[PDB]
Write a protein that binds this ligand. Sequence first.
Ligand SMILES: [Ca+2]
Ligand SMILES: [Ca+2]
Length: 107
Amino acid sequence: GSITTVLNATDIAKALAQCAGSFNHKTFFVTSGLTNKSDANLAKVFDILDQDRSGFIEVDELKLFLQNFSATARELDETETNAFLAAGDSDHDGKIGVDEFKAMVKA
Ligand SMILES: [Ca+2]
Ligand SMILES: [Ca+2]
């Protein structure tokens, strides 16, 4: 269901507080607990993040990434969104698919 059926709330809070100034997706994946979740749980998280059901996380959905973990979190800035996309977009189509998401969280 909600994100705390996947992750611990305390871990989410720490991951959010530590990126208030500067976000790094690898740091967040570790602190939040995403890095140790099963592939199937990461496909669950992908479904949450893909707000328009397009099958891909587009850049407008990446700007809103943190708001899937707490409704009142901040938007990512452009450098942060660009770096997120560049780390995960292995097929170079400008957006993140579910296999890309599962891979980038753990490899
Ligand atoms: Ca989408
Ligand atoms: Ca892609």
